[PDB]
Amino acid sequence: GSELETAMETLINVFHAHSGKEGDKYKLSKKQLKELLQTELSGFLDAQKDVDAVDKVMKELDENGDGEVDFQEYVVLVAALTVACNNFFWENS
Amino acid sequence: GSELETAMETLINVFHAHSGKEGDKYKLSKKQLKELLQTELSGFLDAQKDVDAVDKVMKELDENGDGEVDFQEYVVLVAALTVACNNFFWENS
């Protein structure tokens, strides 16, 4: 349909990727969320210019890293650390 | 970097699209969230097989549609109505 519609289709593509092999199928554990982030990313964490935003995403694990995600919680987090590093308005070129 | 990394780069592409012209620049109003959804989508709402999930996303507007989003709240919602219609495990072909 559009670049936006397929945008979400790309997120689930990686989700069901591991959830299919080993996981809760319908959902995924938070333990993997750690590696799953870097394992797939491994670029946004190579900066982390900010700290307040980086603390929030990290604070989540500090609170309770025992549970399971539900896509919505996995897609939202992916955007969390994104802004923490990503420099759009902060810097142009 | 990867299909996942660019995945988020596609979401912001549409965000700054309107926010740039008319909006809060740093953020966007919720009033547009309505049309912004269909205007861009116009496919997931052509089904809405579920109701409980469709009620949540809609309930948000029922509560208070007066405010501004912050990407994280715009990307998470985009995935909300997605699962409401999207039929992955529910149906294969």
Swiss-Prot record, chains A, B:
Q: Quaternary structure per UniProt?
A: Dimer of either two alpha chains, or two beta chains, or one alpha and one beta chain. Also forms heterodimers with S100P. Interacts with AGER. Interacts with CAPZA1. Interacts with FKBP4. Interacts with RYR1 and RYR2. Interacts with CACYBP in a calcium-dependent manner. Interacts with PPP5C (via TPR repeats); the interaction is calcium-dependent and modulates PPP5C activity. Interacts with ATP2A2 and PLN in a Ca(2+)-dependent manner. Interacts with mitochondrial F1-ATPase subunits ATP5F1A and ATP5F1B; these interactions increase F1-ATPase activity.
Q: Do you know which SUPFAM superfamilies this protein is assigned to? A: EF-hand
Locations listed in the record: Cytoplasm; Sarcoplasmic reticulum; Mitochondrion
More details: Able to bind zinc in vitro; the binding sites are different from the calcium binding sites. The physiological relevance of zinc binding is unclear. Physiological concentrations of potassium antagonize the binding of both divalent cations, especially affecting the high-affinity calcium-binding sites.
Q: Which PROSITE patterns match?
A: EF_HAND_1, EF_HAND_2, S100_CABP
Q: How is it modified after translation?
A: Glutathionylated; glutathionylation increases affinity to calcium about 10-fold.
Q: Which residues carry this modification: S-nitrosocysteine?
A: 85
> Residue limits of the EF-hand domain?
12-47, 49-84
Q: In which residues is Ca(2+) 2 bound? A: 62, 64, 66, 68, 73
Residues bound to Ca(2+) 1:
27, 32
GO terms assigned for molecular function: ATPase binding; calcium ion binding; calcium-dependent protein binding; identical protein binding; protein homodimerization activity; S100 protein binding
Q: Which GO terms describe its biological process?
A: intracellular signal transduction; negative regulation of transcription by RNA polymerase II; positive regulation of sprouting angiogenesis; regulation of heart contraction; substantia nigra development; vasodilation
Extract the Pfam families matched here: EF-hand_1, S_100
Tissue expression, per UniProt?
Answer: Highly prevalent in heart. Also found in lesser quantities in skeletal muscle and brain.
Q: What does this protein do?
A: Small calcium binding protein that plays important roles in several biological processes such as Ca(2+) homeostasis, chondrocyte biology and cardiomyocyte regulation. In response to an increase in intracellular Ca(2+) levels, binds calcium which triggers conformational changes. These changes allow interactions with specific target proteins and modulate their activity.
This protein's GO CC annotations: cytoplasm; cytosol; extracellular region; Golgi apparatus; M band; mitochondrion; nucleoplasm; nucleus
Provide this UniProt record's keywords sorted from A to Z: Calcium, Cytoplasm, Glutathionylation, Metal-binding, Mitochondrion, Repeat, S-nitrosylation, Sarcoplasmic reticulum
Q: Which gene encodes it?
A: S100A1
UniProt source species? Homo sapiens
Task: Indicate what this protein is called per its UniProt record.
Answer: Protein S100-A1
SMART domains xref list: EFh (SM00054), S_100 (SM01394)
Q: Which domain of life is it from?
A: Eukaryota
